[PDB]
Design an enzyme around this catalytic site. Structure first.
Site, PDB file in Angstrom:
ATOM      1  N   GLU A 106      22.744  58.738  63.003  1.00  0.00           N
ATOM      2  CA  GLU A 106      23.029  59.560  61.790  1.00  0.00           C
ATOM      3  C   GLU A 106      23.985  58.799  60.851  1.00  0.00           C
ATOM      4  O   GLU A 106      23.801  58.880  59.604  1.00  0.00           O
ATOM      5  CB  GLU A 106      23.605  60.919  62.203  1.00  0.00           C
ATOM      6  CG  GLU A 106      23.749  61.930  61.066  1.00  0.00           C
ATOM      7  CD  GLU A 106      24.678  63.101  61.384  1.00  0.00           C
ATOM      8  OE1 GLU A 106      25.245  63.121  62.503  1.00  0.00           O
ATOM      9  OE2 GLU A 106      24.834  63.994  60.517  1.00  0.00           O
ATOM     10  N   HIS A 157      23.473  55.280  56.925  1.00  0.00           N
ATOM     11  CA  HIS A 157      24.255  55.132  55.667  1.00  0.00           C
ATOM     12  C   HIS A 157      24.763  53.697  55.502  1.00  0.00           C
ATOM     13  O   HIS A 157      25.441  53.431  54.493  1.00  0.00           O
ATOM     14  CB  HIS A 157      25.416  56.132  55.649  1.00  0.00           C
ATOM     15  CG  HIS A 157      25.008  57.564  55.558  1.00  0.00           C
ATOM     16  ND1 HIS A 157      24.629  58.155  54.360  1.00  0.00           N
ATOM     17  CD2 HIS A 157      24.924  58.524  56.508  1.00  0.00           C
ATOM     18  CE1 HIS A 157      24.337  59.418  54.584  1.00  0.00           C
ATOM     19  NE2 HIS A 157      24.506  59.671  55.895  1.00  0.00           N
ATOM     20  N   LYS A 187      25.075  67.554  55.969  1.00  0.00           N
ATOM     21  CA  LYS A 187      25.788  66.492  55.239  1.00  0.00           C
ATOM     22  C   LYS A 187      25.034  66.060  53.984  1.00  0.00           C
ATOM     23  O   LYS A 187      25.671  65.970  52.910  1.00  0.00           O
ATOM     24  CB  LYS A 187      26.050  65.352  56.217  1.00  0.00           C
ATOM     25  CG  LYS A 187      27.244  65.667  57.102  1.00  0.00           C
ATOM     26  CD  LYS A 187      27.609  64.519  57.970  1.00  0.00           C
ATOM     27  CE  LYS A 187      29.071  64.465  58.286  1.00  0.00           C
ATOM     28  NZ  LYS A 187      29.352  63.187  58.978  1.00  0.00           N
TER      29      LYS A 187
HETATM   30  C1  LIG Z   1      30.626  63.258  59.711  1.00  0.00           C
HETATM   31  C2  LIG Z   1      31.859  63.326  58.830  1.00  0.00           C
HETATM   32  C3  LIG Z   1      33.088  63.700  59.688  1.00  0.00           C
HETATM   33  C4  LIG Z   1      34.318  63.974  58.830  1.00  0.00           C
HETATM   34  C5  LIG Z   1      35.607  63.620  59.566  1.00  0.00           C
HETATM   35  C6  LIG Z   1      36.840  64.201  58.858  1.00  0.00           C
HETATM   36  C7  LIG Z   1      38.137  64.134  59.673  1.00  0.00           C
HETATM   37  O1  LIG Z   1      38.067  64.731  60.771  1.00  0.00           O
HETATM   38  O2  LIG Z   1      39.236  63.716  59.179  1.00  0.00           O
HETATM   39  C8  LIG Z   1      30.584  61.977  60.581  1.00  0.00           C
HETATM   40  C9  LIG Z   1      30.731  60.723  59.735  1.00  0.00           C
HETATM   41  N1  LIG Z   1      29.299  61.935  61.296  1.00  0.00           N
END
Ligand SMILES: *[C@H](CCCCCC(=O)O)[C@H](C)N
Ligand SMILES: *[C@H](CCCCCC(=O)O)[C@H](C)N
Lengths: 327, 327
Positions: A190, A194, A120
């Protein structure tokens, strides 16, 4: 289908478990290998995913599955034990150099084939970029940021960009609804990293007391803004826009399986006719995080193998290559 | 930018003229070559697009531009006269074998490099598929169906497909608003051929009396349904779905520059979790047909050159390769 791609999964928390379930009906991909921190499971005839998940959730490692091996060097062991064509690295990047360190293990082992991650953070993908020649020399084809975002949405933006003379903005807004706290509480820190006034070190050190404390203040909602998110460098490296014109935010609702808003990416630019406009790619609300992370991940593993079989080694991002539909 | 891709455009009706305008600000692509039915224009230093459009619209051919050559074998002549790395085939497929016949000319000439088309009809892309080994042996890298739809929307569907275990439907709905009848009346019979009770032969033989007659019956609106549209075979060849689960329709408003509805593609399938859901990719209403056809076309020419430079020849569709952003 007589010769399926033999694949492994490193990491067997919620994401790796979901990846195993996604591979189950595939004809042209066969899960032969799982590893976690404390054990591994190899089976050239195909993993019993029910048994692996039982072992992991009940006994704390796939090492305790039938045919499972307990080991504190599980990844080193697994790499050498079996014929595996590509691995999905479903590892949390903890510590923040672990993915690069697992990748340095792969480089050191003399193994060649395809690796895929769903990293990410920009700085994590930056560590893998430093290794691109090491990867090439090793004969590894490495697909980085090949999840939901980075990944699916990054590829959507790369395609959408083709209508424009100049890109102005790529804005990613994601939604996550948590259905099973069990297969998430391992990774909630995780996401909390943020949150305003948090960092990776502060989030990772939190007790469940502190997590529940924080979550109670917002009915279990994590509204995340201007995240450190590798979509920025991936679209920059693809020649599409500057990383500063990429912004990533979203909502994880820890108290509802229902997605709290529709995941979308909006690509704004100016056309050759001087007209300012936007394309939007929107995900279905009943496509889960698991589907939108693991589906692309194996689509990129399959694309990666295609690149590998034509002698193309090194580092590719989701913005660089068209993923291949896996049957 | 010291070494731009030298490109040509064959066909200089509304689409080729728009492609020339789109290339004008590009640093890493240079238009050196245009041809129409009656003349051609080569200039290794870069086409004067104002002069070429004047000549075409005022005198009926780019052959009448400064540095223009009148010729009834314009394409045969142009191919042999100049150093060109890739051509955009902006030709109407009229007769229905012309694109394949122009391509057979390229194969016959001993020229190698990249060709790109924005073909629409399944049967047209089928004629190019028959030539894939001829193309490979010739050393040509051929990008077919690399316009708006087929093209942009086909690539969007190929990416969107990665969330799903099984695809149920890909539905493309396009809008076109005509701003300039002048740069369209040459190609309106291409769209009318898709009207109820029409075919390519019946549409092409129509007089302006018959066209105006038909258009007056619907205030200049062409509502087209279940079109013969190569998105079907392109997604089938990409392993994503059966051609029968692809449907293409749309609206061209011959009396309004404003797009009559928002162009989108909706991809419906079942996820590994058994959930039925849809992703939607929607185009901005101020992105014109020209931008959404020609932008992708040169993004695929650039991707094609990348494939060509790594020794990969033959036939690729927009569903097969990630287009590269052109600066
Ligand atoms: C990582 C991001 C996940 C993205 C989700 C998209 C969806 O399925 O519409 C997470 C925030 N740990
Ligand atoms: C060919 C299809 C044009 C697609 C327009 C898409 C958009 O710009 O939104 C026409 C019908 N001849």
């Amino acid at each position: 289908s007589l010769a399926p791609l033999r694949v492994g999964i490193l990491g067997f928390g919620g994401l790796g478990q979901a990846a195993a379930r996604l591979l189950a009906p595939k004809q042209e991909m066969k899960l032969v290998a799982v590893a976690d921190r404390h054990g591994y499971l190899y089976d050239a005839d195909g993993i019993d995913v029910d048994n692996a998940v039982q072992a992991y959730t009940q006994q704390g490692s796939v090492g305790k599955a039938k045919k499972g091996q307990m080991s504190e060097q599980s990844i080193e062991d697994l790499i050498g034990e079996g014929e595996v064509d590509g691995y999905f690295l479903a590892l949390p990047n903890l510590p923040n150099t672990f993915m690069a360190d697992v990748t340095r293990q792969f480089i050191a082992s003399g193994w060649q084939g395809v690796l895929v991650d769903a990293l990410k953070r920009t700085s994590a993908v930056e560590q893998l970029i430093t290794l691109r020649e090491d990867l090439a020399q090793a004969g590894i084809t490495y697909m980085t940021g090949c999840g939901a975002t980075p990944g699916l949405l990054t590829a959507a933006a790369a395609i959408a960009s083709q209508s424009f003379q100049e890109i102005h903005q790529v804005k990613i807004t994601f939604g996550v609804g948590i259905a099973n706290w069990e297969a998430y509480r391992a990774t909630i820190r995780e996401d909390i990293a943020h949150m305003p006034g948090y960092n990776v070190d502060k989030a990772q050190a939190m007790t469940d007391a502190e997590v529940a404390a924080l979550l109670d203040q917002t009915n279990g909602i994590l509204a995340l803004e201007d995240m450190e998110a590798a979509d920025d460098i991936m679209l920059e490296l693809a020649g599409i826009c500057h990383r500063d014109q990429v912004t990533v935010g979203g909502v994880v609702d820890t108290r509802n399986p229902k997605k709290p808003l529709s995941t979308h990416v909006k690509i704004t630019g100016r056309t050759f006719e001087g007209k300012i406009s936007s394309h939007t790619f929107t995900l279905g609300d009943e496509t889960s995080m698991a589907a939108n992370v693991c589906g692309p991940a194996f689509g990129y593993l399959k694309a990666g193998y295609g690149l590998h079989r034509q002698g193309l080694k090194g580092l590719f991002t989701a913005a660089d290559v068209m993923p291949k539909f896996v049957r």
